[PDB]
Design a protein around this ligand. Structure first.
Ligand code: ANP
Ligand code: ANP
Ligand code: ANP
Lengths: 528, 248, 149, 81, 48, 49, 149, 100, 50
């Protein structure tokens, strides 16, 4: 078996900096005593170089169009991540090593928890037909989980990248790292230095892990690093790694994600494979009323609760569960409504405004309400938000002190009327301090006394001249307006580029008035 | 004593990659001096592969009425979680004979302290007639207290979840993980990040620890997680878990 | 920057592998939005209008250069002057210096006599650049106050 | 106003600035605590009927509920002069 | 807790330990005791 | 100058020069804590008023 | 008496062409070029200070630069020196002060080798982003060059 | 009579020659000099000394500055004894009094 | 090699409670082999002390 291992040196394709080291320590091996623990770690090392993959690679798939359909039967809502991975097929299909060095197959997914990004590795690997290992760095604390240990230590096995190479079998595989942002650290080694040693283009060609002291190749292997936030990444690994900021799943892909992918898996898990149906209206109801995070995890757990309450009905009595579950029988399955929808009741309320902003948990409507009472010259915003709505409120009222003859206001209303503004808590300013034109028509509906009809949705901000500021995150608030059955949404006119992100089945109902001026907002909206 | 270990592997009913890995480590352990510390760490390694279970499972009784009467003979009036247990049995009565990826779920029990949501796992063990090991996770600072150390660390253990796999001995236990809200979350220590591997219902069967260091099949473990408040659970970890929100 | 150049070259490569016609492919600014998805930030360019009562300020921050707008409307009220923004009050102090210049020069531009007390002023700061780097755009506010009043 | 309220009517709700009664959460122990003292007429918001159906039978058969949309419907009941 | 002092799982003492025979007595102000612990161990209100 | 005051204050930057500026625009009458004050300079402004 | 000049500090954001100016200055004096990464925390106590009685990998990373460059007067691109100081036990040491100062640049005792190395006439380029978390026994006497955006 | 005298505190704007004032006392005294600059070291237990169980345990910066002199009397400088950041993790005021 | 350090003890390791720690460190020096990974800390200990 010493000569069998000597044949298996040259049988593999095992490269030239490792070959004379393997032959010289095998030359050390046959003359010394085989019962030794030094002989044990020697035979472990010269099992490890001849089991780890070096150049024996799986065949890369020669065409894109049969991988996209395997992605289309595994994940739905990540179209941009699908474009980034067939983008990697477009890079590796065209090149195939035409004097090219300086590769970066190093990809990251950061988003809300439970959006998809640890189940990509059972889909990317099925797509481009490469074998998969799911490497875990959840509670990896020491550096030596990836860095390994020296062979002078008794009991030495290599790092978990090399143990991943032990399980996957072939070189050029795919990796999914499980957690990055809460990869913790201690003394005697920070594992961010170990992932520096993994994830550099300078040292993907050579690795030099501290068990296999020769260079190792991490070049052809493609990486997924999975995290939830960008704040607690170690800043070098945040720096020299390609980040995809995954946006949260909202309802108009959640209706598809249930019926296509998530519901049939768990009614296969329950047992009613063809013996349960759900309406699309109950799926839409579950998302607007029962789920309030951006991931589909309690979509999975409460449609799982629909499936197992249907199994409880199907086993306590033999009656058929092939009844379809609509909106109003769903409360027998799931009990109390945990959350409540937003009512765009189309009768004109006197001092209200149809507000739109976005939570990080999806696009959610607001209702900014305001009254004017003849008091003093002061204002008070009382809706659990900061001063970024307060400066828009002073912007709105100092717009409305101009054009006083236009809207029928009294001559001294600023020092005569107290004005109070309520906002809901769903407006979260990190990119969206939104709904400024809702504040402006709340001031205009309070002071004039003329009602605001609820037929028209609104999104903007206020400059004091009478012009509007643009907004981001336009997709989730337009489909949140499409959720409530309200079809007339006000946008700034310079937000015309965001209609290309919306496909036509949502866009055919949404009567988008691209409106740049606040006087045009108050002329289009405010019911006399 | 290595010549018992081969047929202990063969009647243990291991899966094929971990079975070939344990037989390869047994071929390593055949040749060496048995007095070495490598011999005792590989002997502890093969021993820990044998007395963890792989295909040994207690039979789940499919009686809804026996489970309901044991749930009513230990607890009163906890209607959501008692309906949850009988519909978990209604899943497992229906899927018995259908080979699907049977992930037993991850229950979260929030509410005020003292409801009995925090020591329900003894009654859950009596109601399944499955074996029990409540796992101490009260304010743990150590991530390798959950996922273990490697065997290069000299007196290493695979964590308390695999120690529950020892002392239960079958592949479908109930684990009362106490005080999941009370885990410290910091850059120096965060074992809630170690809870994210072992409590994900699509990849618990690819749980790698650090001492067995193989994908261990944790689809059939009926995990129980407890908390006295909602918000101090980390934002990945509360998302993973069936929150049976039972109030005061 | 070179991350987004990486993404536009590979987005060119994706339609290269399904349409192989590219012996030459020129990309100007108009088909840039076909790549890279949503516009992340927005260019504060020239507003292309010659005459309305506001001006264009400047600032400098390590995010880069920008073309700030400072605007004010002189509403007929109590004579208060307040800032509207989440930056420092030295911008309002430079506005106060502009107020002393218009009180010292109330004749040559057709101002009313009691303009200091017959006009409420709110002064906009829409922005986030210059915390203490270059935190003064005082003649922009002086044109804003004089064109408002 | 110098006017007292009714003695058998306890109440719960949420206020917005127009006067629309927003619904509340966790009502079962609130209704049975109002049932526990000498109150058998409670004010609820209008859209807490979905929470009130989860509340059991003896709580709904002992007391009286009032589904309220606007706070003028509250103050039409509880101002004795 | 007497439901799990019989199965108290120490980090070093890996096998669960029996502590339910042990008379634990604790000392203290209520407000800086945590909420599960002040609900969990029997208060003896000793004033001045 | 009608509002400026040529002042002297000791700094850890050595000797410094001041332009103490006050306009007092008509409003609610409160003292505005402008110009990045310390814990004592509002007390000096209260002594002035 | 001042045979060696004080050493630079390129400061700026992460992403500027500090490697491009290092390759330019090594092309300027007609010199083979080495880049020193020092990317993570890079504990000099753990990885420089071996004292030769381990297995003995990386005998000082300056000497690992020297065996790669093969010439006695290279341009060392020292990078990310602001990332040196750690919040751990023995890991902040600032042991490159003995490397960089001219009063013991001519001699150089190594952590591994324990032999006085001739590190005379060795040019150094130190590039580090944020000026605050530099070790102060470097920037008390090193030069600094502002590279803005 | 008493071997210990009080210890100098130089304080002012940064850069008024205080390191060179210690160097000029070193040149007048014909005695060696070292300057350490604190603030980067965030630990008492770095300076006072961690135990030998840690595998890369180098000792403190103040005895590093004392051993770089190599003589039992240095004109020792403690630069930046006040400018310490908010992360007072292992509190170095007790060790910096206990070396003083 | 281990006698140049003792030359440094009886030339500049003069005080007795200081040198008692170095003497039982010298006792520990011939206990393990000087190629073990623990012995780096032990040799660095009395080199830094001496
Ligand atoms: N597009 C999709 N199609 C089908 N199933 C999906 C899709 N997105 C999510 N899922 C399912 O929802 C689950 C949530 O994804 P998950 O892998 O938990 O992401 P993640 O939690 O953010 N990564 P991590 O936080 O480290 O666990 C997946 O395991 C899938 O089962
Ligand atoms: N429905 C019930 N029927 C009978 N006894 C009950 C019931 N609910 C609660 N109890 C009792 O009240 C106790 C409350 O549990 P508790 O002691 O708080 O758990 P715990 O010790 O806190 N577990 P943990 O804090 O997670 O480690 C139970 O252990 C029972 O003794
Ligand atoms: N009062 C002084 N008279 C003459 N020369 C001076 C004086 N103060 C400083 N210098 C010069 O400045 C040098 C001292 O360096 P300097 O820039 O002051 O830093 P430092 O004060 O010594 N250390 P630090 O105070 O911590 O920044 C001396 O070598 C002189 O060349």
């Amino acid at each position: 078996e010493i000569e069998e291992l000597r044949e298996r040196i040259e049988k593999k394709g095992m490269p030239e900096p490792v070959k004379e080291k393997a032959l010289k320590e095998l030359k050390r091996l046959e003359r010394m005593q085989p019962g030794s623990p030094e002989a044990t770690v020697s035979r472990t090392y010269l099992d490890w170089l001849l089991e780890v993959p070096w150049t024996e690679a799986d065949p890369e798939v020669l065409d894109i169009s049969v991988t996209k359909r395997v992605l289309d039967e595994d994940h739905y809502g990540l179209k941009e991540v699908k474009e980034r991975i067939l983008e990697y097929l477009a890079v590796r299909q065209l090149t195939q090593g035409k004097e090219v060095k300086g590769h970066a197959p190093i990809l990251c997914f950061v988003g809300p928890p439970g959006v998809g990004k640890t189940s990509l590795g059972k889909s990317i690997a099925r797509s481009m037909n490469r074998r998969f290992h799911r490497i875990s760095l959840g509670g990896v604390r020491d550096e030596a989980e990836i860095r390994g240990h020296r062979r002078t230590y008794i009991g030495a096995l290599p790092g978990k990248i090399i143990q991943g190479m032990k399980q996957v079998g072939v070189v050029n595989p795919v990796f999914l790292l499980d957690e990055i942002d809460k990869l913790s650290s201690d003394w005697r080694g920070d594992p961010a230095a170990a992932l520096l040693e993994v994830l550099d283009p300078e040292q993907n060609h050579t690795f030099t892990d501290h068990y296999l002291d020769v260079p190792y190749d991490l070049s052809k292997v493609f990486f997924i690093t999975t995290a939830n936030t960008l704040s607690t990444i170690p800043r070098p690994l945040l720096d020299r790694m390609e980040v995809i900021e995954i946006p949260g799943y909202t309802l108009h892909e959640k209706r598809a994600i249930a019926r296509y992918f998530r519901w049939p898996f768990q009614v296969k898990e329950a047992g009613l494979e063809g013996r349960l149906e759900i309406t699309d209206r109950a799926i839409e109801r579950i998302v607007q009323e029962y789920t309030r995070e951006a991931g589909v995890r309690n979509l999975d757990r409460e449609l799982s609760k629909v499936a197992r309450k249907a199994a409880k009905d199907y086993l306590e009595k033999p009656w058929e569960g092939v009844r379809v579950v609509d909106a109003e029988d769903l409360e027998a399955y799931l009990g109390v409504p945990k959350y409540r929808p937003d009512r765009a009741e189309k009768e004109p309320q006197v001092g209200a405004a149809q507000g739109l902003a976005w939570t990080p948990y999806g696009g959610t409507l607001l209702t900014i309400e305001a009254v004017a009472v003849p008091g003093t010259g002061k204002v008070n915003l009382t809706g659990n938000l900061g001063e970024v709505m307060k400066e828009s409120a002073h912007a709105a009222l100092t717009y409305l002190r101009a054009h006083r003859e236009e809207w029928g206001l009294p001559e001294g209303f600023h020092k005569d009327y107290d004005l109070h503004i309520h906002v809901p808590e769903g407006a979260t300013p990190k990119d969206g301090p939104s709904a400024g034109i809702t504040i402006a028509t709340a001031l205009a509906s309070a002071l004039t006394g003329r009602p605001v009809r609820m037929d028209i949705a609104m999104t903007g901000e206020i400059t004091l001249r009478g012009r509007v500021l643009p907004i981001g995150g336009v997709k989730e608030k337009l489909l949140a307006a499409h959720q409530a059955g309200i079809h007339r949404v006000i946008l700034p006119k310079e937000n015309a580029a965001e209609l290309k992100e919306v496909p036509e089945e949502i866009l055919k109902d949404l009567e988008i008035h691209f409106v740049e001026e606040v006087g045009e907002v108050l002329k289009l909206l405010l019911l006399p």
